[PDB]
Design a protein around this ligand. Sequence first.
Ligand SMILES: O=c1ccn([C@H]2C[C@H](O)[C@@H](COP(=O)(O)NP(=O)(O)OP(=O)(O)O)O2)c(=O)[nH]1
Ligand SMILES: O=c1ccn([C@H]2C[C@H](O)[C@@H](COP(=O)(O)NP(=O)(O)OP(=O)(O)O)O2)c(=O)[nH]1
Ligand SMILES: O=c1ccn([C@H]2C[C@H](O)[C@@H](COP(=O)(O)NP(=O)(O)OP(=O)(O)O)O2)c(=O)[nH]1
Ligand SMILES: [Mg+2]
Ligand SMILES: [Mg+2]
Ligand SMILES: [Mg+2]
Lengths: 140, 140, 140
Amino acid sequence: SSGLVPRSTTLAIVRLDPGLPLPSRAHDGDAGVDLYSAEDVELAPGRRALVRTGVAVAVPFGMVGLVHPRSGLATRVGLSIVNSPGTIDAGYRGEIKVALINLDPAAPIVVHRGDRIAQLLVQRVELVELVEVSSFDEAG
Amino acid sequence: SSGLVPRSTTLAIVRLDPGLPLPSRAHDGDAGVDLYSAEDVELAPGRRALVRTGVAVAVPFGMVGLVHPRSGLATRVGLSIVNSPGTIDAGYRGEIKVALINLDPAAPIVVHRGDRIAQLLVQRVELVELVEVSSFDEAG
Amino acid sequence: SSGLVPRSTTLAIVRLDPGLPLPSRAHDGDAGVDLYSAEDVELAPGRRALVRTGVAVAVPFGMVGLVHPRSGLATRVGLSIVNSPGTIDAGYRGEIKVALINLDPAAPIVVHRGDRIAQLLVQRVELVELVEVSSFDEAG
Ligand SMILES: O=c1ccn([C@H]2C[C@H](O)[C@@H](COP(=O)(O)NP(=O)(O)OP(=O)(O)O)O2)c(=O)[nH]1
Ligand SMILES: O=c1ccn([C@H]2C[C@H](O)[C@@H](COP(=O)(O)NP(=O)(O)OP(=O)(O)O)O2)c(=O)[nH]1
Ligand SMILES: O=c1ccn([C@H]2C[C@H](O)[C@@H](COP(=O)(O)NP(=O)(O)OP(=O)(O)O)O2)c(=O)[nH]1
Ligand SMILES: [Mg+2]
Ligand SMILES: [Mg+2]
Ligand SMILES: [Mg+2]
């Protein structure tokens, strides 16, 4: 039933931390799969941490993985991501790590192992070929 | 004249606040349409607010809406967006709300109703099917 | 050998500052080309600067240039980009300028001319046609 592809893209994933659920789409059509923290971390205002997600992925060639902040946590507690959107290259086989930062002025954020701390989107990217010109009239 | 599609994608939009202009592209080919604030809000340094834009959209299935900061305000006054890029899912029919934050150290930002506070892009996204493997040799 | 396109997209680029290397992909398949600073700038905690990259590009119509923070600098020193992801429109022929900000609480960041301070991705974008509806049942 499920196994039939209705009228993929696939993303190979390794759970380096098998104790965490696989990243999942909260709903049908959702752009991102939620990434989990493998760890407990407390962020004082303005502090940042490179947080392990416990997964590694193989973004297809011609694509990019993008790590985006979750909007609820952003608003509620000022949780953001320092390098957002995080750029995961096709060639990267390492653990996805999220550079969480507390952008609240005063209140610490506690992240617990098992919390959803970001979302991962996958998009095609143009692997551009640079054409250097001395001015734009010239390139056309 | 206009009505002829030259050699769409369409985006259904509801102005929940009809007193605001429709989001518009500043120029031909611009990636984003500018979102307006429905409200007056003042952000002290480091403060954030979830600001109503007065619109709801229906991002097509297979796509994502992305809320990006405007570069002028970013530079001039340190206005950013906490969860940038804001991720609008295909299924979302609620009001788009922008998590504005003042990243200036010292100077408050006043946003007025009618100000352009972000930009909305629409892109295709890969709705990936996760394939869990025990290691990447295996997935190929 | 090289010159043969194996089984482009091209991006015209002008080095307004010819003393800087052309933006390059660190590796095969990398989503972004790294942008360089044309300038020396020191950012105290919470300060931001609009930094010249010494390049101008012609993003193809139907596409967008996106300026993303580099993850290493984000983590190591709290370097981010205020309007990230920076949105470069197809029509823009000006110099790409990066709104760097120091999100570290306490330690200044020194950027040197020649340092890689961001990455530029190019993606297709949907140049959407807005269709205003009074409610979403109506648009379908
Ligand atoms: O900038 C934004 C981002 C999201 N949204 C809305 C649309 C999006 O589909 C919805 C959920 O976005 P996120 O998934 O980033 N938020 P979160 O994961 O915290 O909530 P949920 O559990 O509903 O996904 O919130 C906005 O109005 N503005
Ligand atoms: O990081 C950036 C972002 C934009 N830009 C340039 C290219 C882009 O096409 C142009 C406009 O970007 P935004 O639309 O984000 N800025 P804003 O809306 O404030 O100005 P405008 O009214 O010109 O659109 O600024 C940069 O040089 N660096
Ligand atoms: O949020 C992120 C971003 C990147 N990464 C990993 C995957 C990506 O392919 C790799 C390199 O990303 P960047 O190019 O943004 N970092 P940087 O340019 O500092 O290092 P490198 O010289 O390796 O490219 O780091 C993460 O784990 N999380
Ligand atoms: Mg979500
Ligand atoms: Mg603009
Ligand atoms: Mg890199």
